[PDB]
């Protein structure tokens, strides 16, 4: 937070108080990068 900073502004729709984009910490702490794990042949989705 820069109180004496200068910001750029635009028209738009405001966000809620506890939005995702107001809490980027809570998604990057524990997340791990996706790896490819093969499944058993009875677990594969019959749709796709």
């Amino acid at each position: 937070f820069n109180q004496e900073g200068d910001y750029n502004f635009k028209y738009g729709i405001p966000l809620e108080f506890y939005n995702e984009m107001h809490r980027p910490v809570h998604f990057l702490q524990f997340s791990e990068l996706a790896g490819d794990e093969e499944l058993e042949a009875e677990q594969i989705d019959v749709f796709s």
Binding site: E37, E38, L39, E40, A41
Partner: protein, 75 residues
């Protein structure tokens, strides 16, 4: 996947707990040396302890080079 390596190590202990471990593998200088040089390729050390005694493991959590290897040894 875990009942696979639990069962194979039960059978590996069982055969050693009955002095018949020499039945699992076929006993020959050529057959011992082929089996040793293919056990050093596998990436899990858990299968390496099993493949040397003539007992394989094939589940979907293994990689392809591990799963290609057990099927070639079983064949």
């Amino acid at each position: 996947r875990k009942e696979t390596s639990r069962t194979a190590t039960w059978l590996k202990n069982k055969f050693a707990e009955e002095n018949i471990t020499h039945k699992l593998t076929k006993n020959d200088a050529g057959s011992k040396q082929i089996l040793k040089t293919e056990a050093a390729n596998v990436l899990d050390p858990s299968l390496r302890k099993l493949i040397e005694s003539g007992i394989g493991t094939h589940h979907a959590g293994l990689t392809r080079s591990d799963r290609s290897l057990s099927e070639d040894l079983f064949a």
